[PDB]
Amino acid sequence: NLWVTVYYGVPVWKDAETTLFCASDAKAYETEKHNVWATHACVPTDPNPQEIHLENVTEEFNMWKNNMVEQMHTDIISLWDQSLKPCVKLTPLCVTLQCTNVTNNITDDGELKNCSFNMTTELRDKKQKVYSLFYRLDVVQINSNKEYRLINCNTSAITQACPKVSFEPIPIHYCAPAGFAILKCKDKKFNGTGPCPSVSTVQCTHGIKPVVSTQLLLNGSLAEEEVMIRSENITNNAKNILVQFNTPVQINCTRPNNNTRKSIRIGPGQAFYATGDIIGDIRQAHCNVSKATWNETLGKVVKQLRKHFGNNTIIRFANSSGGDLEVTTHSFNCGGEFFYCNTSGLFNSTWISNNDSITLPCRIKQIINMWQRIGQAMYAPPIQGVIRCVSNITGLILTRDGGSTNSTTETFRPGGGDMRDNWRSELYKYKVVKIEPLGVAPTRCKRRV
Amino acid sequence: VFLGFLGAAGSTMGAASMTLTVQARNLLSGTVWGIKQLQARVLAVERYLRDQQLLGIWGCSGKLICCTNVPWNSSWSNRNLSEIWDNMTWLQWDKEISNYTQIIYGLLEESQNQQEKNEQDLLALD
Amino acid sequence: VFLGFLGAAGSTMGAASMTLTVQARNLLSGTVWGIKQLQARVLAVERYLRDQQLLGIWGCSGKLICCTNVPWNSSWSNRNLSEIWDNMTWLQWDKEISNYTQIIYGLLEESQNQQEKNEQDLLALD
Amino acid sequence: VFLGFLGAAGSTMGAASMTLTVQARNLLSGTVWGIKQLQARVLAVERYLRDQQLLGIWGCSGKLICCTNVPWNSSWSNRNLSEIWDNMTWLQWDKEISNYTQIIYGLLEESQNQQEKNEQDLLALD
Amino acid sequence: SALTQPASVSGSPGQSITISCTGSSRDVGGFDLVSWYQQHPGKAPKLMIYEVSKRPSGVSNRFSASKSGNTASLTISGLQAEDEADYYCYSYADGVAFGGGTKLTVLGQP
Numbered sequence: 001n002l003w004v005t006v007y008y009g010v011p012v013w014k015d016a017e018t019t020l021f022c023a024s025d026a027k028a029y030e031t032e033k034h035n036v037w038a039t040h041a042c043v044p045t046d047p048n049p050q051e052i053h054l055e056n057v058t059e060e061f062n063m064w065k066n067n068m069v070e071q072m073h074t075d076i077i078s079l080w081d082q083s084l085k086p087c088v089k090l091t092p093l094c095v096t097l098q099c100t101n102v103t104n105n106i107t108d109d110g111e112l113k114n115c116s117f118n119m120t121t122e123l124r125d126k127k128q129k130v131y132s133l134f135y136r137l138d139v140v141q142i143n144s145n146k147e148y149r150l151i152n153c154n155t156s157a158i159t160q161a162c163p164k165v166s167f168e169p170i171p172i173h174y175c176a177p178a179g180f181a182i183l184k185c186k187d188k189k190f191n192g193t194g195p196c197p198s199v200s201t202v203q204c205t206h207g208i209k210p211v212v213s214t215q216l217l218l219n220g221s222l223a224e225e226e227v228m229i230r231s232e233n234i235t236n237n238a239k240n241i242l243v244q245f246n247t248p249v250q251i252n253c254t255r256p257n258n259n260t261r262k263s264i265r266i267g268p269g270q271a272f273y274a275t276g277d278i279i280g281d282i283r284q285a286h287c288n289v290s291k292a293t294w295n296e297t298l299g300k301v302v303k304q305l306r307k308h309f310g311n312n313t314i315i316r317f318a319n320s321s322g323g324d325l326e327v328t329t330h331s332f333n334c335g336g337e338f339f340y341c342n343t344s345g346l347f348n349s350t351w352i353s354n355n356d357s358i359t360l361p362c363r364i365k366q367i368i369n370m371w372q373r374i375g376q377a378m379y380a381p382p383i384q385g386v387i388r389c390v391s392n393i394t395g396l397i398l399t400r401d402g403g404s405t406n407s408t409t410e411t412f413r414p415g416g417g418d419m420r421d422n423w424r425s426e427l428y429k430y431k432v433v434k435i436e437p438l439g440v441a442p443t444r445c446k447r448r449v
Numbered sequence: 450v451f452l453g454f455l456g457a458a459g460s461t462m463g464a465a466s467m468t469l470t471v472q473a474r475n476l477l478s479g480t481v482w483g484i485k486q487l488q489a490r491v492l493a494v495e496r497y498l499r500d501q502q503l504l505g506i507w508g509c510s511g512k513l514i515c516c517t518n519v520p521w522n523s524s525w526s527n528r529n530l531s532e533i534w535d536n537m538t539w540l541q542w543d544k545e546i547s548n549y550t551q552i553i554y555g556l557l558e559e560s561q562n563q564q565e566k567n568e569q570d571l572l573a574l575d
Numbered sequence: 576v577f578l579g580f581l582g583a584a585g586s587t588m589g590a591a592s593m594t595l596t597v598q599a600r601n602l603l604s605g606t607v608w609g610i611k612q613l614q615a616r617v618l619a620v621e622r623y624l625r626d627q628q629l630l631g632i633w634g635c636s637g638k639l640i641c642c643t644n645v646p647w648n649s650s651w652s653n654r655n656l657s658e659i660w661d662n663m664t665w666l667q668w669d670k671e672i673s674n675y676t677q678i679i680y681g682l683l684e685e686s687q688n689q690q691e692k693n694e695q696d697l698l699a700l701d
Numbered sequence: 702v703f704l705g706f707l708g709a710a711g712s713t714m715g716a717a718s719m720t721l722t723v724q725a726r727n728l729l730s731g732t733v734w735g736i737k738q739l740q741a742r743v744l745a746v747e748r749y750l751r752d753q754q755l756l757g758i759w760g761c762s763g764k765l766i767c768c769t770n771v772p773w774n775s776s777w778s779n780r781n782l783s784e785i786w787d788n789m790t791w792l793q794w795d796k797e798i799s800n801y802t803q804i805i806y807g808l809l810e811e812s813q814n815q816q817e818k819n820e821q822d823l824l825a826l827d
Numbered sequence: 828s829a830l831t832q833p834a835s836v837s838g839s840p841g842q843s844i845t846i847s848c849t850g851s852s853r854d855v856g857g858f859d860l861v862s863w864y865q866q867h868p869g870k871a872p873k874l875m876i877y878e879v880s881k882r883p884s885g886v887s888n889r890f891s892a893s894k895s896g897n898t899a900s901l902t903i904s905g906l907q908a909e910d911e912a913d914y915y916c917y918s919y920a921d922g923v924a925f926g927g928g929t930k931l932t933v934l935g936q937p
């Protein structure tokens with residue numbers, strides 16, 4: 001006769017979700033720099049990334065229903081506020097600003113407002129007449145010369161990110177607790193959302209930099225020997241096409257002007273770091289990209305993008321339609337200060353059948369409200385000296401638009417304002433499962449009495 | 450063989466019985482944003498105790514191997530021993546038995562420990 | 576019987592001896608004001624192991640049933656079996672024995688394990 | 702003897718073999734600045750369950766005593782019984798043998814429970 | 828419009844009629860996002876049908892519809908005098924394309 005036998009420790013898991021803790025590296029732990037934004041007390045990473053490969057295994061991965069990006073996104077947001085609460089508050093900052101244009105000649109565009117305003121000094125009785133150099137995107141004229149005020153100083157309480165911390169994305173390993181295991185789908189050609197032949201049980205996710213770049217993803221994992229385009233629903237034109245590049249595209253961004261710090265005291269012992277006089281020549285920010293590589297990179301995408309739409313169709317790249325400045329342009333932070341680059345010269349081509357660099361006009365913006373947390377706006381202090389920062393473009397957040405009149409041609413546009421798409425470009429090959437070691441099976445075994 | 454955690458997950462059930470020791474030890478793994486690990490490692494200890502309590506309430510009281518007097522009912526996907534222990538894996542096994550696992554626990558803990566321990570208690574009554 | 580948690584509380588000790596299974600499975604239950612659910616399940620994982628440790632340190636190592644070699648001192652309400660196992664219930668039982676249970680816990684582990692389990696070793700090393 | 706927790710610390714291993722029931726009972730102990738006690742009582746139970754899991758995955762499944770079939774390798778401080786159980790204490794013992802405990806545990810679990818438990822299963826399968 | 832509708836459907840109360848939304852292979856056959864609106868003459872359109880057959884709460888349940896391959900259809904049960912309005916079909920043909928519309932008449936001339 002057959003008797004049921006209990007087996008403990010069996011290799012059995014089920015798709016589930018849980019609170020994934022972190023794991024940071026100890027090689028850069030000496031670089032606390034007074035609690036860098038992301039990692040302060042993150043547990044030290046495992047010295048050995050012990051990953052186990054599995055055979056005769058299949059798992060129905062789904063990068064668009066993945067519960068890890070939801071946990072990572074709310075983690076980054078909650079971790080962001082806890083880095084701003086101990087910083088300085090700039091509620092007394094926005095008074096009527098007598099902003100005049102900086103010392104320049106004709107053919108400026110603006111973009112540099114020399115604002116002078118009364119500021120409460122340490123002593124409540126005395127006041128201080130101090131000036132600063134704000135950007136056009138930070139001030140708006142309220143309505144003698146013109147008077148301005150901070151743009152987000154209605155609506156929201158502006159808060160200055162205290163500059164002791166930094167913004168450089170440090171790799172984060174989202175690790176699962178005991179009883180949970182993260183499965184790394186090591187397959188090459190896999191747009192997520194399907195079965196995975198090669199599933200690897202890894203300790204946890206690889207080093208993931210919490211970068212905020214929207215379109216033109218930066219500091220991202222390269223594709224698998226071929227540009228990987230991932231969409232929740234190809235037919236759904238709105239679905240953001242996540243184009244994972246296989247070869248890193250160089251990009252050189254530069255804050256060309258030499259600005260100084262002011263640290264204007266508004267407290268007792270609270271200092272609004274303001275932009276002093278810009279020493280040197282007055283230029284505007286830009287981001288360079290090798291035209292030889294970018295042309296070749298986009299072409300490699302069209303060859304892959306033509307697979308999902310007819311045998312041969314006309315793929316067109318046009319600059320963003322409209323919206324907030326963080327979607328129409330390429331919003332990202334490299335050297336602690338945020339600047340937005342319009343990138344109209346990056347999506348310009350039109351593909352039918354088959355030395356220089358592009359310079360992108362960039363606009364700098366200090367009063368920031370990322371994640372659209374209305375009522376909570378951040379002020380980014382200036383950075384002394386020029387800001388040169390070279391990153392690797394490894395992604396593209398494209399959106400499709402078409403009247404679909406017989407589907408003769410197709411136009412692809414950039415976008416991806418939501419920051420979950422920045423995480424799905426790294427959290428697509430991972431998923432967490434809870435181990436179910438309790439198992440029953442029939443066997444001729446039978447205990448005694 | 451020691452193929453690491455979940456080493457032989459895809460292997461045959463007969464061969465997957467020789468790797469239960471690596472996954473039995475890894476089931477325990479030895480402010481703000483620190484609440485994640487503190488609420489996770491309190492979930493890990495509470496989860497492992499749930500399986501250990503079940504392993505105790507049943508007639509096992511033992512690690513990685515247990516045999517009970519509950520006869521295998523034909524309604525629970527009646528097959529043969531060779532058709533299961535070598536043609537299937539632990540992954541495929543529960544996927545078809547995920548109907549009675551809650552009630553299989555029932556008759557295996559009620560009719561066994563409330564009976565064979567009471568029968569053992571009255572056997573030593575003399 | 577499956578009469579839920581504490582189903583046979585008022586039942587006599589003889590009848591309530593067969594419902595220990597349901598009262599053992601439910602002893603584990605599988606911001607501000609959200610600390611209530613956290614600090615409670617930390618108290619449950621620790622309270623459950625408070626008994627599981629004593630149940631292991633004693634000469635039982637088993638579940639729901641245990642017999643030892645410590646003779647019952649008549650000072651602890653010397654009565655007959657039917658006077659207790661059929662006349663009394665568990666609530667009235669400990670209420671009259673909750674005087675000396677601290678010394679019964681010590682004799683169950685000191686005089687049993689450090690004597691018999693140690694005698695078990697000399698039975699194997701001889 | 703009951704000399705309190707760690708009472709027989711400096712005593713010989715032969716005499717400290719009877720106080721094991723003591724140093725086990727005291728292994729579980731029944732806002733701001735109050736996070737300390739919660740984190741500590743979570744770490745305590747996690748460490749205790751880690752040790753209990755290590756003990757269970759061995760051929761012991763019980764406390765205060767254990768035996769197995771793994772032979773004492775002659776490289777691991779080849780001495781005599783009185784030369785260890787009467788010439789040293791547990792402190793000097795683990796100090797001089799704070800080399801091989803990990804591999805000893807690994808062998809104890811692998812070579813025994815992945816072999817002797819399946820051996821019992823196959824000898825009861827007949 | 829990319830959707831082909833009958834011009835107008837007339838009828839009498841108490842009876843039942845059917846209005847069809849005949850389209851290509853990319854609007855009704857390619858997707859299951861067929862929808863129907865109710866626009867009273869001079870008022871704003873109101874939705875009564877929005878899935879192959881799933882409808883919202885504010886709509887006479889009598890109104891039901893389905894999808895037959897490359898042809899859609901909406902049937903009207905229990906015709907009443909309040910239904911004297913037009914109805915437009917809506918499906919996702921890789922975009923938003925509406926139907927030509929059909930003016931409904933009950934207890935009245937065509």
Ligand SMILES: *[C@@H]1O[C@H](CO)[C@@H](O[C@@H]2O[C@H](CO)[C@@H](O[C@@H]3O[C@H](CO)[C@@H](O)[C@H](O[C@H]4O[C@H](CO)[C@@H](O)[C@H](O)[C@@H]4O)[C@@H]3O)[C@H](O)[C@H]2NC(C)=O)[C@H](O)[C@H]1NC(C)=O
Pocket residue numbers: 140151152154155
């Ligand atoms: C805090 O300050 C910011 C910046 O001033 C403010 O956001 C702006 O608010 C104004 C309204 O106060 C918005 O103005 C509108 O913009 C649109 C698009 O350009 C225009 O079409 C609007 O023009 C008219 O449109 C209609 C014409 O019939 C009518 O509604 C009316 O006549 C309008 O005048 C109008 O100019 C502006 O787009 C935003 N955007 C910016 C620049 O941030 C924010 O609302 C303030 N928060 C408060 C008041 O709490």
Ligand SMILES: *[C@@H]1O[C@H](CO)[C@@H](O[C@@H]2O[C@H](CO)[C@@H](O[C@@H]3O[C@H](CO)[C@@H](O)[C@H](O[C@H]4O[C@H](CO)[C@@H](O)[C@H](O)[C@@H]4O)[C@@H]3O)[C@H](O)[C@H]2NC(C)=O)[C@H](O)[C@H]1NC(C)=O
Pocket residue numbers: 167168169211212213218219332333334335336383384385386387388389390391392
């Ligand atoms: C992708 O990864 C790259 C990795 O290099 C990353 O670029 C670097 O980011 C850091 C941090 O923002 C940049 O560091 C600063 O850069 C400026 C200009 O080069 C320096 O002046 C800074 O040095 C100091 O001196 C300043 C003047 O006194 C101080 O204000 C400041 O506090 C410092 O003491 C500092 O090095 C760095 O330049 C870039 N680039 C490179 C090549 O390192 C990039 O941002 C990542 N991209 C994304 C989207 O995350």
Ligand SMILES: *[C@@H]1O[C@H](CO)[C@@H](O[C@@H]2O[C@H](CO)[C@@H](O[C@@H]3O[C@H](CO)[C@@H](O)[C@H](O)[C@@H]3O)[C@H](O)[C@H]2NC(C)=O)[C@H](O)[C@H]1NC(C)=O
Pocket residue numbers: 102103114116130131133276277278
């Ligand atoms: C924006 O406007 C402000 C205010 O006018 C400019 O700052 C001021 O610039 C003048 C020179 O044009 C400074 O004057 C000189 O200061 C030195 C200080 O040691 C003094 O020795 C000289 O005799 C002379 O007074 C002035 O101090 C400075 N700041 C203030 C508070 O007035 C600012 O330069 C303008 N922006 C740019 C980029 O030019």
Ligand SMILES: *[C@@H]1O[C@H](CO)[C@@H](O[C@@H]2O[C@H](CO)[C@@H](O[C@@H]3O[C@H](CO)[C@@H](O)[C@H](O)[C@@H]3O)[C@H](O)[C@H]2NC(C)=O)[C@H](O)[C@H]1NC(C)=O
Pocket residue numbers: 319320321328329342343344
């Ligand atoms: C996407 O590409 C188009 C390319 O046409 C960009 O359009 C151009 O944008 C500039 C800046 O807004 C316009 O310049 C201004 O136009 C007005 C009106 O003619 C003029 O008075 C100003 O002096 C200035 O020249 C320009 O006209 C407009 N179109 C043309 C003809 O180039 C568009 O801005 C790009 N979008 C993004 C998001 O980058």
Ligand SMILES: *[C@@H]1O[C@H](CO)[C@@H](O[C@@H]2O[C@H](CO)[C@@H](O[C@@H]3O[C@H](CO)[C@@H](O)[C@H](O)[C@@H]3O)[C@H](O)[C@H]2NC(C)=O)[C@H](O)[C@H]1NC(C)=O
Pocket residue numbers: 232233234235236856857858859
């Ligand atoms: C994106 O979403 C669309 C809409 O749900 C998905 O469309 C569906 O695609 C499948 C094929 O992958 C179609 O299945 C086939 O349909 C024909 C006609 O009915 C039938 O004869 C075949 O046997 C088969 O069932 C399905 O019909 C179609 N949806 C509808 C409502 O027509 C599309 O697949 C999604 N794309 C991705 C990448 O997930």
Ligand SMILES: *[C@@H]1O[C@H](CO)[C@@H](O[C@@H]2O[C@H](CO)[C@@H](O)[C@H](O)[C@H]2NC(C)=O)[C@H](O)[C@H]1NC(C)=O
Pocket residue numbers: 096097098116117118129
């Ligand atoms: C700081 O406060 C003083 C208060 O008097 C402001 O001074 C007046 O400013 C207006 C506008 O420029 C002039 O018309 C008046 O003549 C000024 N009065 C005096 C007595 O100087 C001053 O402008 C404020 N500064 C800023 C930029 O906020």
Ligand SMILES: *[C@@H]1O[C@H](CO)[C@@H](O[C@@H]2O[C@H](CO)[C@@H](O)[C@H](O)[C@H]2NC(C)=O)[C@H](O)[C@H]1NC(C)=O
Pocket residue numbers: 328342343344345361
């Ligand atoms: C991004 O930069 C491009 C640079 O070409 C801008 O487009 C041009 O803007 C100038 C502004 O005077 C116009 O004269 C040109 O006709 C525009 N088009 C071309 C083809 O050069 C574009 O507007 C910028 N986008 C922004 C600022 O959002």
Ligand SMILES: *[C@@H]1O[C@H](CO)[C@@H](O[C@@H]2O[C@H](CO)[C@@H](O)[C@H](O)[C@H]2NC(C)=O)[C@H](O)[C@H]1NC(C)=O
Pocket residue numbers: 258279384385386
């Ligand atoms: C930005 O400009 C300042 C000012 O020129 C540079 O710092 C020094 O400033 C003093 C006082 O004016 C000069 O005597 C030094 O020669 C300056 N040093 C240099 C190297 O310019 C500052 O270094 C500049 N920052 C950058 C990144 O160019």
Ligand SMILES: *[C@@H]1O[C@H](CO)[C@@H](O)[C@H](O)[C@H]1NC(C)=O
Pocket residue numbers: 101105106107108109110
């Ligand atoms: C001065 O300020 C106005 C208003 O912001 C702006 O239009 C103009 O370009 C600025 N510069 C010059 C040179 O007038």
Ligand SMILES: *[C@@H]1O[C@H](CO)[C@@H](O)[C@H](O)[C@H]1NC(C)=O
Pocket residue numbers: 189190191192193194195231232233234
């Ligand atoms: C790619 O992603 C789409 C998302 O809808 C999914 O339908 C498809 O099956 C995926 N393909 C693979 C290789 O899994």
Ligand SMILES: *[C@@H]1O[C@H](CO)[C@@H](O)[C@H](O)[C@H]1NC(C)=O
Pocket residue numbers: 250251252288289290357390
């Ligand atoms: C960026 O600068 C480096 C160093 O000069 C150069 O090697 C690289 O090609 C540049 N990238 C671009 C986009 O021009």
Ligand SMILES: *[C@@H]1O[C@H](CO)[C@@H](O)[C@H](O)[C@H]1NC(C)=O
Pocket residue numbers: 295296299349354
């Ligand atoms: C872009 O580069 C690719 C690769 O060299 C080439 O095939 C393609 O024709 C180029 N496109 C244009 C417009 O020059």
Ligand SMILES: *[C@@H]1O[C@H](CO)[C@@H](O)[C@H](O)[C@H]1NC(C)=O
Pocket residue numbers: 344345346348
């Ligand atoms: C974008 O393409 C147009 C031609 O279609 C060109 O005139 C324009 O200069 C390009 N963008 C940039 C920023 O060079």
Ligand SMILES: *[C@@H]1O[C@H](CO)[C@@H](O)[C@H](O)[C@H]1NC(C)=O
Pocket residue numbers: 219222248390391392
């Ligand atoms: C591109 O630059 C980023 C900067 O953080 C770096 O992480 C990445 O590894 C670089 N690309 C490659 C392929 O090395």
Ligand SMILES: *[C@@H]1O[C@H](CO)[C@@H](O)[C@H](O)[C@H]1NC(C)=O
Pocket residue numbers: 053054055056456457458459460461
């Ligand atoms: C796949 O099956 C083979 C059968 O011999 C087994 O050895 C292997 O371990 C299986 N895959 C895994 C890693 O479970």
Ligand SMILES: *[C@@H]1O[C@H](CO)[C@@H](O)[C@H](O)[C@H]1NC(C)=O
Pocket residue numbers: 520522523524556
């Ligand atoms: C076996 O299955 C039958 C039908 O579902 C059921 O009546 C019977 O109680 C089952 N026996 C066991 C051992 O559970």
